[PDB]
Design goal:
6-stranded mixed β-sheet; Rossmann fold; 3 domains; monomer; 44 helices; alpha/beta; 1185 residues; ABC transporter transmembrane region fold; 9% strand
Length: 1185
């Protein structure tokens, strides 16, 4: 794959000369800060030389008593005055430099972004309408704030850290090479082995990642299918069969999760081994070069560090590069749009602006093709004149041509052949804004903007007095309704405000167009969607608006057409006939045929989560054990490093410097081995502990989820997707808070515990300083991580208004371009953008300081340590060896807890991710579908009885649905439910199902309360025929057998049932006859076919009650008669409840109940309800006319 990018030198266009300066000065800061630590290593070397030169004098030979005290100790006091002034000189320069670095880089980036946002938005408002046709507008709108956010990363402070890290790469290989080159070329012969070992594992972890997501995609497909189809699952009691399907695919992602779990801690301990190895090789050889008096101890300790810093400086500049290349990549898709220039320029000032326009309209030989399907021509040889002041109604078969015409006179596309002229003048030779200013567009649907009525109207022409507004609202017929609104002309509309009816919205659009007072009117589907009531007022207001104006109307209603001055009949791009209404009627062509048809904050306890993994404690004992050893190897290293340098800095014979040095040097590989072993076992025990924990919790969850009742799955929050998510990643993210949290705290204890002890005993004065200051620098490392995020909140919240403006403008682009207010939205955008600008120009001032005072409180404290420890050596109270044993036991160990804690998963995000799991498991439903108790008699009568049923939906508890609902269905009769639209009718079906309990009243079945009968044996004798029947990705045998579970479903039973559903004959000529894969994967069945499959399943169950709920929710004409035959078959001699919408179903029913607001207004046979002349009569009379 090759994703494109921008040339580096391009991407910094829009950078003023001052931004070109800021990036330079800020770079020079970044270089200085880069080399500033290598100097701290050079000095750290000359400091050990200053201690070593005297450290062995005062010990080995006792020559003089007090003429040796003052001599050497007044030498060290004067040496360390200089080393301390040197360190503080660094921290001072750091304090200045780091400020200039992040200050000037974030500044130049902000100044460039503010110039990008406006040019990019303007670039989008300048595009063509065929440009919008091809593109997905949703991703474009997110692309306005995501891609610009991807660039601001890769041009801000992320560069100053890069030139910093490279200035350390070269400053460090400089000091290393110029102070001694043998040690360096030793290391740089090994560093390819470690950059290789590092890169290898990132290729293997990415391998076992995507292999894992393809392992769970099988289980998570069954997951998505169930929780969408849960109504069918509960209604057919397949809550355990789907648990087994979801489980038998759940072992794949486990075994793969282990091959990932092991190999992650292999990758850890493997590279953690190669550190202790190249440590030994570089120290064994470095000691052999000081024994022979080539180097000193200060030389080695300079070079080894000043190499490892510059060599590790690469891994710290990896992401700062990747972020700069992400910024290049996002900058390509944007700069393409900015550099794209349209043919129809809505901003240019080119064409004529002719005055006194009478509106002669002429189409000449027009040919046109849309550019999304450019193979099909839409219009071919289209010719036609509109004389000044005439009205033209366009009629003809369904097609995009009529609207295309309206789009061509707006000039929203440029026709290919031919020419469109107004008063003899090519419309492509005037200006676009003058053109659309003279044209009023009345779209099918009117866009209302979330603003006041005054502003929505003023969008048509922003310089207008309130008198003229009043005139237009009057003329458009929207005035009297506005005067009755509570905040008259100030009422707030749009999506945020009060919803206006269709008629009122359209009349507002008409008033806006009146304000525009154009010379040409174009109306498309003006009264299509609108009902007859709204249509009459709108027609009166349109007719008002049209008087003496040239008008093209896309007519759907005949009455619009009858009063037009001329009618055009279009067919296939070609005007087949033109004339007045009576002429086209006389022609008895197309038009005549037309007129003669129309007539989330749960707190979970830590111990509670830990108990979930309790079933695998033996794994935990081991993992704890290796987490203590591995947590103990760090203070060991702090010793073996100190004990090394102690030899060459306190005093000894050169007979022991070999065996002591080589011993400690191979104790590095003792430690390195124990690292690799304790990691391979840590990640073999805590690894399985986690990959077990996921699989066992996904099972217990999905089980507990199908145990829940329907009120839960009705909630807005428990949608089928947020449950697949919660079931998929949140179920797995727990394991970062069970074993990995013990591994953390046992490592951290075994590290800081034994290292606090050791450093305290070897000398406690230095420690109380360091462990007093570590609270401070640890705080600083925290507050940076905080305020980096809390400022992300502040700036990105102040950006939502600026983004909502753009969302409003892109989502209705076709409207605003017709109002020619692209400039208005440009100004509104900029004015909204003026807050986060001045905020960002203070932001760089802030992060200059938080970055400066982090590094200053660290470089200063390096002096506050090696000064105090030095005075502890002056007073002969502590050795320099014991200093290194304190310093690299606190510092290198506190860095160890960070290098651990930053690797492990986010514990907070894992805890709340787990607390949701515990809630979904420990929840017990109102309706335990899983239960085993209940009467379950042998009485197959099926007397149904509702007595005074009272019920309210718990999703919408404020509203009522059913009040005093009473009704009997006698054995074997069919009952039809009728009434006005409402949930009561469906609710009866859901209550016999027992998907909900009632608040009061009673539902009885053969004299028995249904709340006292097993849910499985209630629902087993109930057949649910749903509206949109759900077919499962599965064979016909399994989909039908899904109904009667735990039942010998044989070839015989399928065939008799498929006969009686009327699908056998259609099934048997299909190619794989009964093995044919159906569902989304297989041949897509029509709406009619699916329901007939559902019917066969209901016959297989052979229940004594049949619940039919708004079946026939389709337009398949033949399927309808097939279904109705199959249904008459399916009902015969069975007790049936039908939610009836069709009159014919009602006529043949044995009993009808007319329900209104929970109340049985009337009931009886068909004939008696007709002759009653009541509600039922009203329904049948409406269909009758």
């Amino acid at each position: 794959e090759k994703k494109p990018a921008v040339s580096v030198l391009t991407m910094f266009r829009y950078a003023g000369w001052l931004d070109r300066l800021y990036m330079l000065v800020g770079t020079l800061a970044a270089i200085i800060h880069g080399v500033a630590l290598p100097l701290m290593m050079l000095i750290f070397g000359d400091m050990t030389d200053s201690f070593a030169s005297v450290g062995n004098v005062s010990k080995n030979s006792t020559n003089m008593s007090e003429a040796d005290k003052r001599a050497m100790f007044a030498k060290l006091e004067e040496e360390m005055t200089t080393y301390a002034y040197y360190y503080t000189g660094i921290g001072a320069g750091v304090l200045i430099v780091a400020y200039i670095q992040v200050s000037f880089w974030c500044l130049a980036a902000g100044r460039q972004i503010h110039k990008i946002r406006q040019k990019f938005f303007h670039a989008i408002m300048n595009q063509e309408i065929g440009w919008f046709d091809v593109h997905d507008v949703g991703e474009l709108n997110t692309r306005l704030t995501d891609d610009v956010s991807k660039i601001n990363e890769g041009i801000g402070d992320k560069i100053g850290m890069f030139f910093q890290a490279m200035a350390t790469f070269f400053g460090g290989f400089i000091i290393g090479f110029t102070r001694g080159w043998k040690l360096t070329l030793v290391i740089l012969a090994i560093s390819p082995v470690l950059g290789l070992s590092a890169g290898i594992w990132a290729k293997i972890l990415s391998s076992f990642t995507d292999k894992e997501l393809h392992a769970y995609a099988k289980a998570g497909a069954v997951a998505e299918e169930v929780l969408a189809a849960i109504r069918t699952v509960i209604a057919f009691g397949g809550q355990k069969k789907e648990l087994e399907r979801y489980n038998n695919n759940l072992e794949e992602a486990k075994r793969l999760g282990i091959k990932k779990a092991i190999t992650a801690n292999i990758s850890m301990g493997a590279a953690f081994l190669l550190i202790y190895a190249s440590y030994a090789l570089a120290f064994w050889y470095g000691t052999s070069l000081v024994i022979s008096k080539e180097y000193s101890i200060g030389q080695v300790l300079t070079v080894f560090f000043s190499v490892l810093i510059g060599a590790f400086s690469v891994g710290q500049a990896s992401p700062n590069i990747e972020a700069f290349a992400n910024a290049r990549g996002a900058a390509y898709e944007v700069f393409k749009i900015i550099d794209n220039k349209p043919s129809i320029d809505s901003f240019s000032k080119s064409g004529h602006k002719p005055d006194n326009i009478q509106g002669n309209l002429e189409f000449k030989n027009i040919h046109f093709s849309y550019p999304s399907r450019k193979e099909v021509q839409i219009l071919k040889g289209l010719n036609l004149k509109v004389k000044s002041g005439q009205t033209v109604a366009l009629v003809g078969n369904s097609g995009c041509g009529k609207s295309t015409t309206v789009q061509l006179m707006q000039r929203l596309y440029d026709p290919l052949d031919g020419m469109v002229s107004i008063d003899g003048q090519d419309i492509r030779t005037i200006n676009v804004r003058y053109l659309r200013e003279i044209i009023g567009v009345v779209s099918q649907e009117p866009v209302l903007f979330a603003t006041t009525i005054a502003e929505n109207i003023r969008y048509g022409r922003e310089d207008v007095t309130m008198d003229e507004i009043e005139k237009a609202v009057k003329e458009a017929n929207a005035y009297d309704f506005i005067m009755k609104l509570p905040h008259q002309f100030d009422t707030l509309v749009g999506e945020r405000g009060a919803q206006l009816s269709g008629g009122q919205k359209q009349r507002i659009a008409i008033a806006r167009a009146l304000v525009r007072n154009p010379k040409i009117l174009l109306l498309d589907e003006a009264t299509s969607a609108l009902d007859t009531e709204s249509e009459a007022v709108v027609q009166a207001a349109l007719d008002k608006a049209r008087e003496g104006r040239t008008t093209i109307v896309i007519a759907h209603r005949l009455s619009t057409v009858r009063n037009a001055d001329v009618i055009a009949g279009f067919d296939g791009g070609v005007i087949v006939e033109q004339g007045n209404h009576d002429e086209l009627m006389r022609e008895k062509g197309i038009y005549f045929k037309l007129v003669m048809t129309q007539t989330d904050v749960p707190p979970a306890s830590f111990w509670r989560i830990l108990k979930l993994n309790s079933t695998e404690w033996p794994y935990f004992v081991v993992g704890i054990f290796c987490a203590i050893i591995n947590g103990g190897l760090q203070p060991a290293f702090s010793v073996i490093f100190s004990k090394v340098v102690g030899v060459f800095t306190n005093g000894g014979p050169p007979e022991t410097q070999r065996q002591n040095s080589n011993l400690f040097s191979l104790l590095f590989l003792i430690l390195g081995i124990i690292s690799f072993i304790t990691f391979f076992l840590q990640g073999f025990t805590f690894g399985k502990a986690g990959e077990i924990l996921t699989k066992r919790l996904r099972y217990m969850v999905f089980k507990s989820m199908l145990r829940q009742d329907v009120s839960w799955f009705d909630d807005p929050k428990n949608t089928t997707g947020a449950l697949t998510t919660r079931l998929a990643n949140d179920a797995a993210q727990v394991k970062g808070a069970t074993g990995s949290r013990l591994a953390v705290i046992f490592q951290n204890i075994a590290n800081l515990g034994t290292g606090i002890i050791i450093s305290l005993i070897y000398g406690w004065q230095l420690t109380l300083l360091l462990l007093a200051i570590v609270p401070i620098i640890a705080i600083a490392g925290v507050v940076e991580m905080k305020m980096l995020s809390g400022q992300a909140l502040k700036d990105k919240k102040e950006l939502e208004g600026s983004g909502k403006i753009a969302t409003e403008a892109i989502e209705n682009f076709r409207t605003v371009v017709s109002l020619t207010r692209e400039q208005k939205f440009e100004t509104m955008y900029a004015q909204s953008l003026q807050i986060p600008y001045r905020n960002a120009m203070k932001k760089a001032h802030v992060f200059g300081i938080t970055f400066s005072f982090t590094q200053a409180m660290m470089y200063f404290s390096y002096a506050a340590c090696f000064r105090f420890g030095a005075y502890l050596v002056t007073q002969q109270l502590m050795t320099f060896e014991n200093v290194l044993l304190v310093f690299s036991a606190i510092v290198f160990g506190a860095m160890a807890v960070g290098q651990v804690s930053s690797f492990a998963p986010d514990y907070a995000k894992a805890t709340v991710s787990a607390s949701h799991i515990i809630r979904i498991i420990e929840k017990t439903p109102e309706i335990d579908s899983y239960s085993t108790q209940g009467l379950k008699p042998n009485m197959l009568e099926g007397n149904v009885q509702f007595s005074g049923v009272v019920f309210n939906y718990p999703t919408r508890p404020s509203i009522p649905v059913l009040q005093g609902l009473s009704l009997e269905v006698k054995k074997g009769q069919t009952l039809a439910l009728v009434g006005s639209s409402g949930c009561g009718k469906s609710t009866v079906v859901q209550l016999l199902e027992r998907f909900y309990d009632p608040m009061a009243g009673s539902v009885f079945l053969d004299g028995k309360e249904i709340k006292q009968l097993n849910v499985q044996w209630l629902r087993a004798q109930l057949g649910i025929v749903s509206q949109e029947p759900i077919l499962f990705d599965c064979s016909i045998a399994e989909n039908i057998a899904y109904g009667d579970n735990s039942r010998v479903v044989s070839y015989e039973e399928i065939v008799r049932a498929a006969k009686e559903a009327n699908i056998h004959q259609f099934i048997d000529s299909l190619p794989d006859k009964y093995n044919t894969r159906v569902g989304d994967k297989g041949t897509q069945l029509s709406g009619g076919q699916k329901q007939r499959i559902a019917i066969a399943r209901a016959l297989v169950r052979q229940p004594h009650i049949l619940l039919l709920d708004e079946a026939t929710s389709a337009l398949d004409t033949e399927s309808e008669k097939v279904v109705q035959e199959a249904l008459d078959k399916a009902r015969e001699g069975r007790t049936c409840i039908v939610i009836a919408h069709r009159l014919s179903t009602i006529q043949n029913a044995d009993l009808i109940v007319v329900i209104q607001n929970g109340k049985v207004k009337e009931h009886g046979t068909h004939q008696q309800l007709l002759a009653q002349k009541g509600i039922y009569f009203s329904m049948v009379s409406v269909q009758a006319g």
